[PDB]
Each structure stands twice: as structure tokens, then as C-alpha cells.
TrEMBL record, chain A:
Organism: Deformed wing virus (DWV)
Protein name according to UniProt: Genome polyprotein
Residues of the full protein shown: 903 to 1150 of 2893
Subcellular compartments: Virion
From TrEMBL, chains B, E:
Region called Disordered, residue ranges: 1-15
High-level lineage: Viruses, Riboviria, Orthornavirae, Pisuviricota, Pisoniviricetes
Protein name: Genome polyprotein
Organism per entry: Deformed wing virus (DWV)
Whole-protein coverage range: 116 to 363 of 2797
Location of the protein in the cell: Virion
UniProtKB/TrEMBL annotation, chain C:
Protein name: Genome polyprotein
Full-sequence portion shown in this chain: 487 to 537 of 2893
Subcellular location: Virion
UniProtKB/TrEMBL annotation, chain G:
UniProt organism field: Deformed wing virus
Superkingdom of origin: Viruses
Shown part of the complete sequence: 1057 to 1150 of 2893
Subcellular localization, as worded in the UniProt entry: Virion
Protein name (database record): Genome polyprotein
């Protein structure tokens, strides 16, 4: 058995339990679920606009962390090149299933003004870890799905709450190779598409502005099965 | 206290595990490791056809993999990446006959959708002078991962819970594997929404932690046996056996 | 969905909370702590003698 | 206005011309066991309009559906016509296994033999047998999962009419959401109205 | 009193016989005939291996013989000398596939010794203007007699009890056949003390009492269907399916 | 009669009722009236200004869905060309009167 | 009944169109103008949106999208059941 313990040869006396930083900082860190809800960078894009209802960029919504986009050799996304993957997939690497919600809080640029619609599409499957990333009848606005418009003129950030709309017990969590054909419905919570409502004369002001997306799990996430960590890379040895 | 009296019967006391009509014995105590609690039956939510377990035939044990394990196998050597609801059938096809010929798996031929928990007893028959240690580890849904080839080593499977098969004491490894999957039923044949990767709960894989070490006159080989029970099973979707394709 | 049709409030945005005020005033902050009710605490050996 | 009220209404969705000279193995229908039952209109439009059962329309606004379906077979027969027909049900058939079918492979699975002698109407309550608790919509937006299971209807004993009555008997096949039918996630509809059938290819 | 009101539903009331997942309907009332009382289970006296009935799969109905019955068949014409624990398997082999492909008979492939009672419903689909009458008769252990060829006629089978299938009222024939044999278990395969005549309880045979008579424009044919339930069954002797020979 | 049911030849056992997604998603979908209040695209225009109080555009207000404007052959409104009519007239096609 | 929204504060006006008709209830399918007074039996009214820009500013407003949404809001009661018309399946669109 793994955590069996035959002959304890302790030398220690009683160490005072601080309660995971309670007795020093006035706050607990025993539960990792409430650390999971600190917002983490999810993905970052640069708008290359190449109609009003065309979805400007789409991304599958998943707590696993996306397929990491460093970038090209010339302009790497300096956090995703340097500071690898953050917290939430570093914990999700330690599990196998999840069942819960997500939050997003998409941060738009400021120079854009036009009103923005956001769709949640639980229809669209994920078709493997390749192209499980931000992608600049799918290509347009759709009627029936859960929608939300944020006005950029008032506040250029839309806070979301993506529920758990899957016909599963719980979903997959590691990297996903598209093994079975219907197992592809077992990864994402859906497929969010952000689309501007600017015309063609205004859309050129919006080209090459950063749109950063955050995420956090929000009160419902329950990572179920324990699975050990993969090989890691130490960051201060990066050249 | 430690009062030996060997005889014609031997010294130790034999323990058992009796099932339907298959009784297998172990001299040694099992190193049980249970990755997850026992599951709820899930036949209420998704089945109107007649669900009937077959505890007289399905809960029998069945040997699915024996293999020689030599000392010349290296440090982190795979021995058997058994996919348990697949290797039960594909070992029967490794005996070069149909699935209908075996009493343990005839509901897989008739019924379409399997659920249930699986016991695994990996017996070993090492000599007492042999020194080596294996680990039996269960990993849910192996083929759904792509980085698992970088994880498939003893340093990764010793973090999740697992059984240990020491060749020193000829240890035996009970392994209670409950059904956990994305969908609450595994399909046993070609199926309208997935065909590739059929009847695949995960992977019992038995890496080597430290190999056999012995003297120059030592017994080199070490046979290893794997048994599987299918205890709290159930089946649904009565269908024709002519739709059952052969496993990969 | 009952439609809330009473006429709502009517007030004044400002840019920044008060700076000179510092006694009888619960001051809202965007905290950088992880717990929301978390307060810095002094252990029994860190007793501040000098009020 | 209620999905258990809309889905609890029959809609005529299939109509079998069942003749006398069919053998004991003849297939009458192999329609899918989903709310999305197809019935084509013979139009000359570039988009052929399709009728749907009301359970199919009200499930076409939802992503996932689950539950029993109840198909009412109103065979139109006199009291002197005698027939007997299996309405069977195979759980889990794909595209390649959609063929190879007869009544003999059907009688393995769940099947219902009906004795058309005096009463001429019954209601086969289709089981919902799938591995998944809900089940994803068949069609989707402009973007195609088949049914969890397929209905079949074979002619077990062939039609024996008296000499003073007709040779052929037509069967109406109505589809209704059952007593346990339920749908959950609201998405883009897979069905559009015929109020403006103009479609402009760009 | 005799108040007709036909409609879109028809006039009559439908009766059923629901089983595991096979529901078959009859407009007409059965003419039940039970040759012997219900038998005691007999698993205590001659079985130590695990005896487990399978009521979720074995008690289903299964069509084993349909046949056209024309008016040009003579007076005392055989129609089907079905041997019921044999014709259940040999009809599956008449569908040109193995016994494992059918959910009703997979315990015959795995287990070795069958016991149990058998229901038979011989439905007919005659027109109401057709005039003729069959009889369904069960005879225990047909092949053990030699003078049965001189007995095999309607004058002999109308003395033992039997069901009557009148083509006038499209009558249906329930037939409760309990297990009575010399030995209290029927063997389902090649067996150490007998090989010839395997799994042979007797003979359901359906002679004609009076043939179809009709006008010159009448419907000549009359399809007949036979169904079999295996209700109070049991099986013993778990064995390999590779010993199961094909039936004759 | 339409929803009459003469001879039920059920094979099924009892299926567990999830309460229209209540037991999985924490929310109900039995009532279609509360799905009707999810906002749907009604109509979309492009301003072609050809006084201060001139009404810039008018539209009749109706839950039936408008007469659908795809557009010309060159620039179709890509949702109304592709994704037809949405939810609320797909339900209003299933009725005859409304009061609300 | 009128309402001004200021575009400078928030460029979205949320409305609530009541049921001002002299009917029991209104028609709901496509409407062919059969009777002359039956024409009062379809709409809830006739909303008109108008800007207040002058002619020098109105040219900046030309060819900008104005999207309108809708939903029924607590009072809608579709009364008579009428079956669905022929539909068109969307994934067969070219
Ligand atoms: O903008 C406002 C402020 C107050 N009230 C109502 O006026 C009443 C008296 O307000 P005070 O007391 O505060 C309460 O019913 C309160 O809800 C409003 O309707 N609108």
C-alpha cells in the first residue's frame, strides 16, 4: 500500500500547529479549493482581423489550462514562454476528473469602444489537445445559446459563470488525445466565442490589441480522482 | 511468541477467497490498495431494459496474464499494461477461441453495456531468496491521456496509491478497482457515438521498482499471475451477439 | 421574472475615497490577501508593547 | 407552456404501406429511436422542408434529451384482416450495423409482437438504453450524432385478408414523448421555420 | 349484453404476456393445456457446482418456427415435430450463426446441464373466414419410442391432453410443459454416459385435425408462429464453451 | 382522439426522473415559459441616413418574430441567412394566441 | 409612452412593452391582413427609435449596427395549442 507506515523512528517533539498560517496571517491555506479561485491568466491573443456577428475569437472552456501558446520564434508571449502554466493546471495535473463551474472575467483593451457579445456553446466538442486553444455555423452569432453583451464604453470587462452542462458524471482533466469519438464531449464545459459588433471601418482600430482572459473555478469544482504529478521543469534553470 | 512447529501440514495458516465455484488460496497476506470508494449502482438513471447482474458466473475469477519475469529486465521495465475490461476479452482471444466459450464473459457477448467493480489479485511465486519489488498500479482512462508516456514510470505511479509485490516475502496484491469513468456505463461493442477505444476503463500496469537480484546460481525467472473478479457488475442493453466485433 | 419597475437611485460617482479620514470609517479596499475576512494577527510572542 | 405538455402530444411522422405479398422477413421501417424523426415533403424547393413530431421540435431547441419515447401504431384494419408484426428495438446500432438486420437478429433484443386481429392500435414505449444519462441532439447547428438505438418493425406473420376486403393496409406511426421524457440544456435550434424559405448562398 | 362500439382503437381488449423485455400480445384467449404439475427444483440432489438460473435472459420468449400452412396440406399432415430443447438451438443454427449470438441460449453454451419448465405459445394468424383446426400436442421423449411412427396421428394425440388451434376464431395455444424425464437434468452437450440424442425432452408436434377450407377466391396460406419461454429453468456444471458441439 | 392510448405494450422498467435536469445541473427545464425569457436576437439593421425628432427606425413590436430579413444577394445578415429564427418563434409557431 | 436613454452613459435601453390591446389575446402566426380590424390583433404596438443628432453629426452614425433583442417577461401566456409547421434542418444548408 502507498501511504502505509511500518516503523516510525521519530526523533521530534511536538511542533506547534499554526493552522496553515492562521496563527500568523489571520487566514487559512489548508484547503486548496479556495486557493483555486484566485484568478489566473488563461490565454492571451493579439487581434488580427483579416460582419457584425462574426465571432472574433473562440476558445474551448476548460479548467485544464489550454494548449500553451508560446508564440513564434520572434515574439513569444513572454509569460507563456518564461513562466510556465501557473497554478490551476499545476493542481489539475494532480487529478483526473473534475465536476464544476468556471469563471472568466475577460479583460478587453481600452481603445475599442464597440459592444461585445459572448456566447457559451455546450454543443461544440473538443477534438483533441491539438487546436484546443484560442482560435481567431460556428463562425457567427447564434440565437439560442446562453449569451451576454458587455458594453465596452461603460466597463471593458465581462465577468462570466460557465456552468456544468455536460451529460457526464464528470469530465476529463489531463491532456486529451481524442481517443474515442464521444469521449470528445468529456473535456470542455463548452465553447465560448467572443465577438465584437464593429463595422469594417472601425475594426481596423481594433487590430493587434491584447485581449487577456482569466479564469477560476468558483464554488462548484470537485476534482475527484487522485493521480500523481507528471515530470516538472524547474523555472530558475531556464536560460 | 514466534513458536515454530512445522510438520506434514506445514506451519502457516492458509487463507482463502471463495467465489461462485473458483477458490484461490494465498499463503501470504494481501497488500490491499483501494483508489476510490464503492460506487452507486447507476442503473436507475439510464436503463429501461432489463438489468440483471450474473453473480453466479461474472463474479468468478479468471487468469488473464501470466508472464515470466527475469532478472535481466531493467529497472523501469513495463511488464503488463493490462487494460482490464479489454484484456479480459483479448486474453480469451489470445487463447484463440471466441468469447462465448468462457463462462465469465458470455454476458459481454449478449448484453451491450457493462458497468461494475473489478477485483484484481496479482499473485507472484518468487523464491524466498529472491530480492525484487514490483508495484501494481491502476490508472483511470490511460488512452485518453497523451502525456502518459512521459508519466509511465515508477516515480509517477508511486504518488497515486498502489499495491507493492515484494519478491522477498512472495507478497500478493489485492486491488479493489471500482468503476469510475466519465460515462456511467462502458459499452462492450461497436456503439453509435464511439467505436474507437472500446470497453476501456483504464490500465492496470505493473512496473518494476527494483529488479530481481540473486547469486550466480540463483533461480533467474519468476512467474507472475494476474486474476480478475468482476464483483458488483451489471449489464444492460440486450442485443444480438452478431454485433459483437472482436476486440483489438 | 417579476419586473422591478420602481425608479432606482440617483447619485454621484467620485473617483477616490477620502485620504484625510482615518478613525471612524470602514474603508473599502481591493485586497491582495487570499481570505476576505483575513486580518494580520500577532502571536503571543509578538506582543506590541508600545501603543 | 410546458415541455411535458408539448412533448406529450402525438404527431404522425411515419406511414407504412403494408401490402399482402410481404414475406415473413420484410422490413417496414427502421426509423431511429430519437425525437428527431424524419419525414420528407415532396417539394421542388432547394431546401426540402421536413415535418417533425412535436417531441422532435421541442427537443430540437435543447441540447440533451433523455427518457422513454412512446410510438403509437394505429394500424388501419378491419376486424377481418389478421396480421402480426414485431415492433422491435435494438440498443446501440451504428451506420455499418444498421444493415445486416432481420427479425431473427431482432428477437435477441427487446421486441414486441403485436397480434392484429380485432383491436388495431398499440403504443410501443421505446426504452431509453444508453451509456450516457442524457443524449446529445442529432442535428445541431450548421456544423451529427446518430440515435442511441434504433427501432425496427418487421412482419412476423404476413397479412391474411379475407376475399371481400382489401389487399393492403396502411399503418400510421405516431411519435410522442413518454411519461418520463425530459430535456435539459437550451442551445441554438437545429430547426428553422418555413415562414421565409429564402436562403442566399454567399 | 353484446354491445358493439368499434372505433379507431377497435373493439376488443388486448391482453398481454410481459416478460424480461419481450412483450407479446394476443387478441384471443389462450386454450391452455397443462400435461403435468409444476416440478420440484431437484438442484439439491445432484449438484454441488453453482446453480444459478438466469431469469433476466432465459425467461424471454423466442420464435423458433414459423411456417406457411396451406389448404393443400392433407388431413393428417405433420407441420412441425419440434423437439423443444433441441429446436431452440437448431433454429438458431438455422439462422446460420452460433448459439452465443442469442441472449436466450448463452447459458447453454457455458453451463452443461439444463433443467426447467417450458412455456409454448403457438400463435396463428388465420383469416376469420378460414375454417380449419390444428392441435398442439406435447409428447415426452419421442425418440425413445419406436412405435411412435404408428402413433403419430391425430387419433392418438387427441387422447392425451393438448391444445386446439382453430383457424376460425384465430385461436392461440398456451402450453405449459413442465420438466419430466427419466433423469432430473438434461445435458446440453457431449456427455460421458450418453452422446446420441442430446438435450431431448420430447416433441411438440402439431398435426392437422381438419385442413383449411375456403372458397375459390379465398386466402390460401395461413402463417403459424411458435414461441417458447424457459421460465423455471436452472443450469449446472460450469464448463468451457469449446466442448459444446453443434446440434444435429 | 389525439392523445388516446389503447394498448400499452411497454417493455421498460422505471427510469429515474432527474426532474428536467434538476438532479444534475441544479436547475429545471420543465417549464418553457422561463426559457422564453432568455433574450433572443429580434432584428438587426444598418443605418442609412438619407430633423432632431425624425424617427430613425420604426418596428412593429411582436413576439412572433419579424418577417425575416436575410438581406440582398451581396451582404446577407449572416445569422438570419444561416441560423434561422432562433427559439421564441420556434415556440410561437407551436401556438395561436398570446397575451402578455 | 416614451423613454430617453443617454448614449454617453450607457448605450442600451431596456424596455417593457405592456399589453395595450382591446382584445382577449392577439394573433401569433404569420398574418395576411384578412379583416380590416383584425390588423389591430397582431402587434403590441409600434416602437420607434429616434436619435437626436443634427445633420453634421448624423453622418458619423451612418452604417453602424443597431441590434434589438427580445423576451417575454412574466406575463406571456400562449393559449391555444397548434401544431408545428414544416421545418428546415440547418446542418443540411450548403
Ligand atoms: O431611490 C429610491 C429610494 C427609496 N425608495 C423607496 O422609498 C421608500 C422610503 O425610502 P427611505 O426610507 O430609504 C422605500 O419604500 C424605498 O424602497 C425608492 O423607491 N427609490
Amino acid at each position: 500500500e502507498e501511504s502505509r507506515n511500518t516503523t516510525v523512528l521519530d526523533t521530534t517533539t511536538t511542533l506547534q500547529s499554526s493552522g496553515f498560517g492562521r496563527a500568523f496571517f489571520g487566514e487559512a491555506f489548508n484547503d486548496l479549493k479556495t486557493l483555486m479561485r484566485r484568478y489566473q491568466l488563461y490565454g492571451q491573443l493579439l487581434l488580427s482581423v483579416t460582419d457584425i456577428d462574426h465571432c472574433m475569437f473562440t476558445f474551448p472552456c476548460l479548467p485544464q489550462g489550454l494548449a500553451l501558446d508560446i508564440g513564434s520564434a520572434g515574439s513569444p508571449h513572454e509569460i507563456f514562454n518564461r513562466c510556465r502554466d501557473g497554478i490551476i493546471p499545476l493542481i489539475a495535473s494532480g487529478y483526473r476528473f473534475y465536476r464544476g463551474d468556471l469563471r472568466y472575467k475577460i479583460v478587453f483593451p481600452s481603445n475599442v469602444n464597440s459592444n461585445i457579445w459572448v456566447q457559451h456553446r455546450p454543443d461544440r466538442r473538443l477534438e483533441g489537445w491539438s487546436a484546443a486553444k484560442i482560435v481567431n455555423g460556428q463562425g457567427v452569432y447564434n440565437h439560442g445559446y446562453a449569451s451576454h453583451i458587455q458594453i465596452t464604453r461603460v466597463n471593458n470587462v465581462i465577468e462570466l459563470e460557465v456552468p456544468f452542462y455536460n451529460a457526464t458524471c464528470y469530465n476529463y482533466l489531463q491532456a486529451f488525445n481524442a481517443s474515442s469519438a464521444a469521449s470528445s464531449y468529456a473535456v470542455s464545459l463548452g465553447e465560448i466565442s467572443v465577438g465584437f459588433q464593429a463595422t469594417s471601418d472601425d475594426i481596423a482600430s481594433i487590430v493587434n490589441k491584447p485581449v487577456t482572459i482569466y479564469y477560476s473555478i468558483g464554488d462548484g469544482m470537485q476534482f475527484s480522482q487522485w493521480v500523481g504529478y507528471q515530470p516538472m521543469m524547474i523555472l530558475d534553470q531556464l536560460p | 511468541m514466534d513458536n515454530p512447529n512445522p510438520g506434514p501440514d506445514g506451519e502457516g495458516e492458509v487463507e482463502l477467497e471463495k467465489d461462485s465455484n473458483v477458490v484461490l488460496t494465498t499463503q501470504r497476506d494481501p497488500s490491499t490498495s483501494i483508489p476510490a470508494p464503492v460506487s452507486v449502482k447507476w442503473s436507475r438513471w439510464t436503463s429501461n431494459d432489463v438489468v440483471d447482474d450474473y453473480a453466479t458466473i461474472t463474479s468468478r475469477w479468471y487468469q488473464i496474464a501470466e508472464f515470466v519475469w527475469s532478472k535481466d529486465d531493467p529497472f523501469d521495465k513495463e511488464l503488463a499494461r493490462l487494460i482490464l475490461p479489454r484484456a479480459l476479452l483479448s486474453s480469451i482471444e489470445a487463447n484463440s477461441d471466441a468469447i462465448c466459450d468462457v463462462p465469465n464473459t458470455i454476458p459481454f457477448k449478449v448484453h451491450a453495456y457493462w458497468r461494475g467493480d473489478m477485483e484484481v489479485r496479482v499473485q507472484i511465486n518468487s523464491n524466498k531468496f529472491q530480492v525484487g519489488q514490483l508495484q501494481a498500479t491502476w490508472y483511470y482512462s490511460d488512452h485518453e491521456n497523451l502525456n502518459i508516456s512521459s508519466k509511465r514510470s515508477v516515480y509517477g505511479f508511486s504518488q497515486m496509491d498502489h499495491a507493492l509485490i515484494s519478491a522477498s516475502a512472495s507478497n500478493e496484491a489485492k486491488l479493489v478497482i471500482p468503476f469510475k469513468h466519465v460515462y456511467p456505463f462502458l459499452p462492450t461493442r461497436i456503439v453509435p457515438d464511439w467505436t474507437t477505444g472500446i470497453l476501456d476503463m483504464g490500465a492496470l500496469n505493473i512496473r518494476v521498482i527494483a529488479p530481481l537480484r540473486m547469486s550466480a546460481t540463483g533461480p533467474t525467472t519468476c512467474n507472475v499471475v494476474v486474476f480478475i473478479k468482476l464483483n458488483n457488475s451489471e449489464f444492460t442493453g440486450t442485443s444480438s451477439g452478431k454485433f459483437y466485433a472482436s476486440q483489438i | 421574472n417579476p419586473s422591478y419597475q420602481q425608479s432606482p437611485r440617483h447619485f454621484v460617482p467620485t473617483g477616490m475615497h477620502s485620504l484625510a479620514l482615518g478613525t471612524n470609517l470602514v474603508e473599502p479596499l481591493h485586497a491582495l490577501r487570499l481570505d476576505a475576512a483575513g486580518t494580520t494577527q500577532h502571536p503571543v510572542g509578538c506582543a506590541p508593547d508600545e501603543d | 407552456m410546458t415541455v411535458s405538455s408539448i412533448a406529450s402530444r402525438y404527431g404522425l411522422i411515419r406511414r407504412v404501406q403494408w401490402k399482402k405479398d410481404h414475406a415473413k422477413g420484410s422490413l417496414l421501417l427502421q426509423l431511429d429511436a430519437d425525437p428527431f424523426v424524419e419525414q420528407r415533403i415532396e417539394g421542388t424547393n432547394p431546401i426540402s422542408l421536413y415535418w417533425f413530431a412535436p417531441v422532435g421540435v421541442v427537443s430540437s431547441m435543447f441540447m440533451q434529451w433523455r427518457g422513454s419515447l412512446e410510438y403509437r401504431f394505429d394500424i388501419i384494419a378491419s376486424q377481418f384482416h389478421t396480421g402480426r408484426l414485431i415492433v422491435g428495438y435494438v440498443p446501440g446500432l451504428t451506420a455499418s450495423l444498421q444493415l445486416q438486420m432481420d427479425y431473427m437478429k431482432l428477437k435477441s433484443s427487446s421486441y414486441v409482437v403485436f397480434d392484429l386481429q380485432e383491436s388495431n392500435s398499440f403504443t410501443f414505449e421505446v426504452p431509453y438504453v444508453s451509456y450516457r444519462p442524457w443524449w446529445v441532439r442529432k442535428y445541431g447547428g450548421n456544423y451529427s450524432t446518430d440515435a442511441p438505438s434504433t427501432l425496427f418493425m418487421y412482419v412476423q406473420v404476413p397479412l391474411i385478408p379475407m376475399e371481400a376486403v382489401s389487399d393492403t393496409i396502411d399503418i400510421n406511426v405516431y411519435v410522442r414523448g413518454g411519461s418520463s421524457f425530459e430535456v435539459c440544456v437550451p442551445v441554438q435550434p437545429s430547426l428553422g421555420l418555413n415562414w421565409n424559405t429564402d436562403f442566399i448562398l454567399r
